[PDB]
Amino acid sequence: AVSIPIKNAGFEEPSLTVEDYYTIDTPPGWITYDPNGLVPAKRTRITSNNGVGYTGPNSAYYNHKAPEGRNVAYVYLAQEIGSGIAGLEQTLDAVLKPNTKYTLTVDIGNSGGSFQGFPLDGFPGYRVELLAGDTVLAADQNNLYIKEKDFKTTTVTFIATPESPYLGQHLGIRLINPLQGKFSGVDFDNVRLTAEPAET
Amino acid sequence: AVSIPIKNAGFEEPSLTVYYTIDTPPGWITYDPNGLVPAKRTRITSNNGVGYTGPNSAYYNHKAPEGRNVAYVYLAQEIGSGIAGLEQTLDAVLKPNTKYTLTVDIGNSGGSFQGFPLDGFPGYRVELLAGDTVLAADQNNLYIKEKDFKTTTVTFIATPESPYLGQHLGIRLINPLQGKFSGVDFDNVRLTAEPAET
Ligand SMILES: [Ca+2]
Ligand SMILES: [Ca+2]
Ligand SMILES: [Ca+2]
Ligand SMILES: [Ca+2]
Ligand SMILES: [Mg+2]
Ligand SMILES: [Mg+2]
Numbered sequence: 001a002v003s004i005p006i007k008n009a010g011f012e013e014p015s016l017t018v019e020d021y022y023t024i025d026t027p028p029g030w031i032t033y034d035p036n037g038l039v040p041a042k043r044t045r046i047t048s049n050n051g052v053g054y055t056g057p058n059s060a061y062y063n064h065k066a067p068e069g070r071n072v073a074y075v076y077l078a079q080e081i082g083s084g085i086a087g088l089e090q091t092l093d094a095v096l097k098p099n100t101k102y103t104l105t106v107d108i109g110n111s112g113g114s115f116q117g118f119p120l121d122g123f124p125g126y127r128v129e130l131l132a133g134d135t136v137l138a139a140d141q142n143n144l145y146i147k148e149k150d151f152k153t154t155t156v157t158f159i160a161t162p163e164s165p166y167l168g169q170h171l172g173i174r175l176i177n178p179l180q181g182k183f184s185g186v187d188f189d190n191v192r193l194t195a196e197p198a199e200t
Numbered sequence: 201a202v203s204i205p206i207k208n209a210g211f212e213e214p215s216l217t218v219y220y221t222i223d224t225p226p227g228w229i230t231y232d233p234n235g236l237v238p239a240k241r242t243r244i245t246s247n248n249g250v251g252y253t254g255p256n257s258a259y260y261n262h263k264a265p266e267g268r269n270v271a272y273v274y275l276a277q278e279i280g281s282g283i284a285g286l287e288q289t290l291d292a293v294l295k296p297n298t299k300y301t302l303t304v305d306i307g308n309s310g311g312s313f314q315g316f317p318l319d320g321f322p323g324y325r326v327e328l329l330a331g332d333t334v335l336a337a338d339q340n341n342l343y344i345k346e347k348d349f350k351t352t353t354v355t356f357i358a359t360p361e362s363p364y365l366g367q368h369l370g371i372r373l374i375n376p377l378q379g380k381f382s383g384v385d386f387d388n389v390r391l392t393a394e395p396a397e398t
Contacts (some may be wrong), residue, residue, distance in 0.1 A: 081363050082333070090298075122361040127337075135280070136380060139325075142336040145299075145357040145396070159343035163320050165279055165379060180333065181363055200345065 001103065004094045004171065008195035009191045011073040016054040020061065023051035027073050029090060033174055036084025038077050050075045050088060053187065058081035060113050061120065063149045067107040068190035072151075074111075075177040076185040077124065085127070087176035088188070094171045094195070096132040096160050101198035104130045104138075104156040104173060109187030112148030121148060123199070124177050130156050130193075131172035141178065151189065161200045201301070201394040204292045206371065209389045210266040211250045221249035225271055225290060231372055234282025236275055247274040248286060251385070258311040259318060261347045265305040266388035270349075272309065273375040274383040275322065283325070285374035286386070292369045292393070294330040294358050299396040302328045302336075302354040304373060307385030310347035316381075319346060324377040328354050328391075331371030339376065349387065357396045 007029025015022065024043050026032045032039055032050060039048045049069035053074055055066040058178045066072050077086045110123045127141040160167065175188045207227030214221060222241050224230050230237050230248060237246045248294055248330035264270050273285045304326050309318045325339040336356035344350045358365065373386045 123359070125335075136339065137323075137378070138340040140338065140341065141334065143338065143355050145355075145398075147398070157341050157343075161321075163379065180335070181359075181361060198343070200343070 004092060004193040004195055006092060006191055006193060008132040010068045011052045011071040011189060012069040014052065016071060017033060019054055019056045020059055021076065022053040024049050025051055027052050027088065030088040031090065033089040034086045034175065036086065038079050038084050038086045046078060048077045048079065048086065061111040061149065062109065062151065066189055067151045072109055072187040072189040074185055074187045077177050077179045079179065081153055081182060083179055085176050085178045086175050087174060088117060089172060089174040092171040095168050096164065096166050096171060097195065098160050098162040098167055098199055099198060100129060100160050100195050102158045103194045104128065105153060105192045106175065107151045107153050107189040108144065108146055109151045109189065110146040110148055111185055111187060120183045122181045122183045124186050125180040126186050127176040127178050128154055129174040129176065130158050131174065132166040133169035135166055159198045159200060201392040204290060204369065204391040204393055206389055206391060207288060210387060211269045211271040212267045214250065216250065216252035216269055219252040223245050223249055223338040223341060224342065225250050225286065227286065228286040231287040231374065232284045232286065236277050236282055244276065246276045248272060259309040259347065260307065264387055265349050270307060270385045270387040271360060272383055272385045273373065275375050275377045277377065279377055279379060281377055283374050283376045285288045285372060287370060287372040290369040293366050294362065294364050294369060295393065296358050296360045296365055296392050297396050297398050298358050300328060300356045301392045302326065302371065303351060303390040305344065305349045305351050306344050306388045307387065308344040308346055309383050309385055318381045318383060320379050320381045322382040322384050323376045324356050324384050325374040325376050327354055327372040327374065328356050329365035329372060331367035333364055335364065348391050357398065
């Protein structure tokens with residue numbers, strides 16, 4: 001299977017030193033996906049936020065360290081359940097090829113324990129999408145159950161046929177918080193995308 | 201794992217011979233958020249209904265995965281115009297510490313219908329609902345060859361912290377209109393609940 005390059009795929013940029021420290025800017029190489037205006041221009045302690053978090057072996061939020069490297073990404077939404085969806089996305093240089101099976105793998109984290117006076121109990125869910133152009137080709141929404149303080153790996157698969165209308169369009173990836181529970185933060189790590197031949 | 205009743209789950213109503221209806225299958229509702237499916241339908245409008253699929257069908261390598269009949273969802277509009285399909289609200293309600301398994305066969309109709317080729321596919325999406333909310337979904341994780349049905353599984357665990365407990369379960373079977381020929385079929389809808397370890 002051939003690995004397709006992804007920018008800051010492990011959220012290892014930026015490098016952090018302080019255990020359980022969290023940035024508050026979009027991870028480099030990723031874009032804030034925010035179709036419903038849930039992530040404000042000015043981010044404070046009490047707003048929706050995304051960024052990266054140093055998750056080591058003695059994390060207050062996870063039983064084991066980051067699935068990959070030191071860092072995971074997080075998408076937190078402060079608004080009420082049902083207000084919309086937001087996350088991270090990235091357009092790749094790779095393009096959709098026919099007779100090709102695409103496998104998009106991502107680790108999803110459900111932070112647990114305690115944060116800023118209040119429990120991290122609960123989980124907003126997740127959605128992971130493979131795109132070509134602005135089309136969602138394939139997606140998984142909440143097929144995996146993720147325990148508090150745990151990470152689980154989800155897989156999104158798609159085969160492009162010779163008749164596909166999206167051949168040659170740039171691939172993309174979206175990591176989404178669908179805001180379907182509180183505490184409404186969901187973490188991501190170790191984004192991988194492979195292509196391999198498929199007979200159709 | 202206890203089975204959760206669905207109305208006309210295999211699309212066996214109405215009984216057919218030789219072979220298709222153009223009205224919403226009984227037990228199900230047209231899902232049409234983007235207004236692509238008229239109340240008044242013809243041969244050539246966007247459409248849904250039930251199809252008799254025997255062992256020597258023009259459209260499939262094999263007979264219906266279950267019984268005699270399958271459901272179809274056909275959209276006449278251009279690729280990217282929106283989504284539509286079939287949905288059903290169940291009597292059962294979402295329950296905590298429970299794993300739900302939604303199983304549906306997806307079909308890629310092949311061959312030809314009265315001279316018109318069925319080559320190509322619009323994709324699919326299957327959704328498990330509570331009230332108005334999509335709890336869990338699969339869009340196009342499976343590849344379905346022309347003239348084939350494949351089984352997809354959508355799973356969801358409802359925790360004690362879920363905000364949708366007590367809301368009526370539902371099922372949506374969607375044509376996302378990502379290709380032509382823009383017909384996709386479904387059969388043998390199943391839903392079970394079983395105890396989960398949260
Ligand atoms: Ca990492
Ligand atoms: Ca949590
Ligand atoms: Ca049937
Ligand atoms: Ca077809
Ligand atoms: Mg914004
Ligand atoms: Mg309508």
